[PDB]
Design a protein around this nucleic acid. Structure first.
Length: 461
RNA sequence: AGGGUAUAGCUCAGGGGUAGAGCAUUUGACUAGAUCAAGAGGUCCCUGGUUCAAAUCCAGGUGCCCUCUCCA
């Protein structure tokens, strides 16, 4: 629709192209088709998902209660607009709010501000512009000025700059609450509101300080993962890469906080964020540790990690990935070496996971990337190296089947869940479109028009 | 078969031989700053290797980072 394709390095785009145009897909579909599929994918990745999906913290509040509170909240924020809040029939603890946009009738103001690419993506998903996000602003900007926010998708703007000839993307207009002086004079690492978005291209609710103990903003497949893992109350669960602990706290909430959930991560601050989230949402079965997942298997002779092999009931490998499935992702200035730099680490973490998994246990491997090398290929590799593992069907089944290329069978591909951004056309949700929308169309939209994601389920013998 | 990164207070270019920009700060003019000038600034992370010579290339060490919705 409104945005161009995702700006990739030629080498990177040709890499992904090599991925989606392999012998198998070409055979089953033909080059003329697969190419358009790939291009459509690249065209969709630049645009936000058409649904704001929020997870309800069932361990503190019910879905109904939270839904009503969010109805009041949306009534407040949107000044009396009428957007619905659907409840997913398959994901019981997930609420869905449709995204209104894009709006092409936004009049660009002369007073401008430039945020980081990440902050831009956040704004497109309904966030305001907080002070640490602004990297550039008009030198004559005062608090209260109606300004136009642009996203530095290339990340080539040097902080403090009064002008920028690089690549900008209009995100919408908002009222400023700081002057350029207040932001860039001296060095105050100040926090708070910088730009209150009043006219965004995509209209979505702001989830900053609203129902912090009841809500958790989370993409549909990410919430789906914990459901697929299917943890039972009283079991022992371990996710090697947990931070900031969305899927962790979800797992804990599914177990009614009755059991043991061990969460690991390499970076300290991230682990602290896990703990903060757990304490916030009221989960007490969560125990977080700063630790290298690859070195989590006990070897030397001595409750904390490392752990003895086959000592966990279920294991979730939410492995680190290229993040190519991220939406909206307008530009990626990465090297190819950087993009494919994850396969070895993923494999190490996988091996460590399998070693730590009890027999008849469940191992869920999940990424938010679209590359074959990090998804289906890893599944084939895993099924080869570990013959004790066996691919399992998943519930609920929401995403598409696995992509051909790794040499798996159709029966094997059907047991995988791959979310494809190019599944459905980009819906230009308007109020008139809202009024005339069948519910099943909205649900199919939420299920299909989502970020890139991949889920695989394994059982040990 | 993990990767990226370390340079001025901040944000970052650059590049085998005299240290670069924007912003911040400092000073001077003009009417506190949508003005004009002027200079103040850094053992270029540590160690070792290649080399006549390493801030640059290489290896090891260390710190930070690799978004899976919102103080970026």
């Amino acid at each position: 629709s409104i945005f161009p394709k995702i700006s990739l390095r030629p080498e990177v785009e040709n890499y992904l192209k090599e991925g989606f145009m392999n012998k198998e897909i070409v055979t089953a579909l033909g080059k003329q088709e697969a190419e358009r599929k790939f291009e459509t994918l690249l065209k969709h990745l630049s645009h936000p998902p058409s649904f704001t999906t929020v997870r309800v913290n069932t361990h503190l509040a019910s879905v109904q209660h939270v839904k009503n509170l969010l109805l009041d909240e949306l009534q407040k924020q949107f000044n009396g607009l009428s957007v619905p809040i659907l409840q997913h029939p398959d994901l019981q603890d997930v609420l869905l709010i449709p995204v209104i946009g894009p709006r092409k009738n936004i009049k660009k103001q002369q007073c401008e501000a430039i945020v980081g690419a990440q902050c831009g993506n956040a704004v497109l998903r309904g966030a305001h512009v907080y002070a640490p996000g602004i990297v550039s602003a008009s030198q004559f900007m005062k608090a209260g000025d109606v300004i136009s926010v642009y996203s530095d998708i290339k990340g080539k703007c040097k902080k403090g700059a009064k002008e920028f000839d690089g690549t900008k993307v209009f995100l919408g207009n908002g009222i400023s609450e700081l002057s350029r002086k207040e932001i860039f004079s001296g060095l105050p690492e100040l926090k708070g509101m910088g730009i209150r978005m009043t006219e965004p291209v995509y209209l979505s609710p702001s989830f900053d300080s609203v129902l912090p103990r009841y809500l958790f903003l989370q993409n549909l497949p990410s919430a789906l993962v914990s459901h697929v893992l299917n943890p039972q109350p009283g079991e022992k669960i371990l996710d090697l890469c947990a931070a900031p602990g969305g899927k962790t706290t979800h797992i804990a909430a599914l177990m009614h906080d009755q059991g043991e959930v061990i969460a690991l991560d390499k970076i300290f601050n991230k682990v602290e964020k896990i703990k903060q989230n757990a304490l916030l949402l009221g989960l007490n079965s969560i125990r977080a540790f700063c630790f290298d997942g690859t070195k989590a298997v006990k070897l030397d002779m001595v409750g904390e990690p490392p752990f003895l092999p086959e000592s966990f009931d279920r294991i979730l490998l939410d492995a680190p990935c290229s993040g190519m499935g991220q939406r909206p992702n307008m530009a990626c200035t990465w090297s190819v070496k950087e993009v494919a730099s994850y396969q070895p680490l993923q494999r190490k973490l996988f091996t460590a996971a399998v070693q730590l998994l009890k027999p008849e246990g469940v191992l869920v491997y999940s990424t938010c990337t679209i590359t074959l090398a990090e998804n289906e290929e890893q599944v084939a590799w895993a099924l080869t190296k570990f013959p004790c593992l066996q691919l399992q069907p998943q519930e609920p089944q929401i995403g598409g089947e696995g992509m051909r290329g790794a040499g798996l069978s159709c029966e094997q591909l059907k047991q995988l869940q791959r979310f494809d951004p190019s599944a459905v056309p980009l819906p230009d949700t308007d109020m008139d479109s809202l009024r005339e929308a069948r519910r099943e169309d909205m649900l199919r939209l939420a299920n299909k028009d989502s970020i890139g994601f991949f889920i695989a389920k394994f059982v040990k013998c």
